[PDB]
Symmetry: C2
Subunit: 402 residues, 2 copies
Amino acid sequence: MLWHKLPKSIYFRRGSLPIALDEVITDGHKRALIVTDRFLFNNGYADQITSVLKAAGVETEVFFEVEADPTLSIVRKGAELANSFKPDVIIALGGGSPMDAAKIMWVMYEHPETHFEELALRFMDIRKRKFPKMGVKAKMIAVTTTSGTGSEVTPFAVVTDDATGQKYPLADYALTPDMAIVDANLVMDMPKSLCAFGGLDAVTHAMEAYVSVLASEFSDGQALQALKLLKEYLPASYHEGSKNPVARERVHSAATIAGIAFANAFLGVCHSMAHKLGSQFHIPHGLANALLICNVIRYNANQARRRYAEIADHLGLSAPGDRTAAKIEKLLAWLETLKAELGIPKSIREAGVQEADFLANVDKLSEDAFDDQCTGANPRYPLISELKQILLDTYYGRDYVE
Amino acid sequence: MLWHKLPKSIYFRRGSLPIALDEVITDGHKRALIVTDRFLFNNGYADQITSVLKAAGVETEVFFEVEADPTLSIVRKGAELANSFKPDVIIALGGGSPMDAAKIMWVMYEHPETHFEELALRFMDIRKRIYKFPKMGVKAKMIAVTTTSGTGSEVTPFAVVTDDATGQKYPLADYALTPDMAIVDANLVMDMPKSLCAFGGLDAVTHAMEAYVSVLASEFSDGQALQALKLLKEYLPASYHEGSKNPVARERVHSAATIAGIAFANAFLGVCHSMAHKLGSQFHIPHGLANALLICNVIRYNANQARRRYAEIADHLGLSAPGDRTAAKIEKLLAWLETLKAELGIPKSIREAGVQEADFLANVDKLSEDAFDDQCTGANPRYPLISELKQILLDTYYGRDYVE
Ligand SMILES: [Fe+3]
Ligand SMILES: [Fe+3]
């Protein structure tokens, strides 16, 4: 049996934020905790939420100390703030890090009796087994400011234990936000690199969700629609920025639609390896995926290859009388051209990772990627040896070949 | 602002019903009211639910008196049973009639003080309102288990009920009526006769077709409308011809009808449903057959921006050729639909559907006016004249293609 599980409400288009918040007000919420990071707090993004809520007599508090990774110490501090402030709605504001952090703060607030590493142990991934009851003390709203991680519609969160550096993925549909707000007025200032990295992150989400062993007829159409929107609007969004708000808005929705797909179909080894590259070498998550995705397609295309050919057909990249190999070659050629015009380097070496450093860690990276939660959904069951070959090829800029 | 609003949980594929019901049990529900019709009760469909729930110590009650249309007297009786039995979950089982009836029983149970009167008038459609729908989901959550493929009502905010005493129909629309969970288990549709398979499938085709060209279509509904159409193109003929011998085709079409529901729950429909409603109530034509008879002429009408969208559907379904322009792509979309109708045994005209000429001519003016006022008209990409709806109805009665 399969499922399609999403927030009850996803509000989108420019200007949806104040209208969605009016529903929060009319639903009777009186105490709102905003969870965000320092850049977004400092640059007025939290004010866009708190001004509307305060005008209606809602009490507000802002926790702005989440950084680039959700850490256990920061999550505990935010949960302690919730315990004292007692919100009846938590509003995550930002990219993947604040939204993921807010999900775990929410659990700890709803269930102060539970120890995190308890939860970390039992709810590592989606399977049948129960998650503690959520949404009694507070509802969860996610407001995304990049285009994007899709975390505003997913059951996933990761937090790093400061003391050990160990990452703990959590996954349960009780962590899916109650409402997602996708308002492109919040992304018109994104710099080019963040536009590129978030957009290729979204491409990767939809690509991995489409060929995942858990792909379904309920996820497939959203995955393909996300890819079509990104093909058609991501270059203009990157090049033109705020001068083309429609392109910015289309990509903002596309990243959420990719989230809808992978929230239910999950991902694959491109994310498994991207996680390890990013954390070891401090490469942005979207850049790591951009560097790996074409070799992962080459790897999975040896059924995934039929599915990749369908994506090429959907994106208008195929010609009359192409058979599968030629269609996949055209899908890869489109991705390499997209990466190039978005300023993505051609190798991890050209991303700034330098040779002795990479060879010292490549075996640990391969082993850890194998153990990553996203590996189980990949259409090809990997050998550690093979993940190492992909990583090396991607380091030196070679196409993966068997 | 646009939206994408659905049940929190949709469970699907063969065998999904017992797994979905285990979440109902582990969520702590102890009293379940099943709402269905007599055919489904008598043929063991309700047993598939109650056996699982009772084995877990959930108390169950089954209301099986829903008729072919939700009627106000039956809805009131089901609400009174709810008032006495006090369920903490209502489980609708069936096609559109039980699922729509259950939504209204739910309202009356949550809010017995409210006058149905009132609700029917204030909440006829989705719009911006100072006054909000009464709070739902306090006494009970709502689960919808669909047994046709299908109306999509398991994911929509819509319900209609007929006043027996007057014959007046009351459409209701609010996202507080959207079920909390939809269950789409094709083990419940393997015995559907050919005609129910055909009518339900072309209803689903029509939902997805109208949702795609609606003025409220969005990037969040568009991909689901296209996926529904693709699944229906690829599996509805085999589902119809082969039935239970091809469970994958029955299962694909069952998901496709729900996926079409996702699209039109959010993007709404158009004048094909407007006119089909009026054919159905006046001449007692099944809903999916009425839509099947009209959709091709509604496309011809809307294609006079709708024509570009229809061409995109033809491209998506693999129906266009190299160097086709818009007009040719739409012609190929229409040719595919006509061939699908023919092989599903759909008649070529309303006349061959059993309505005779004198009765049709006597009511066609009222039908055209009533269809215009139908709430599905507002989403149609072409704002109609009553004059034009009348022409479509006459052309469809006599089996002519609509031409401008
Ligand atoms: Fe990602
Ligand atoms: Fe319908």
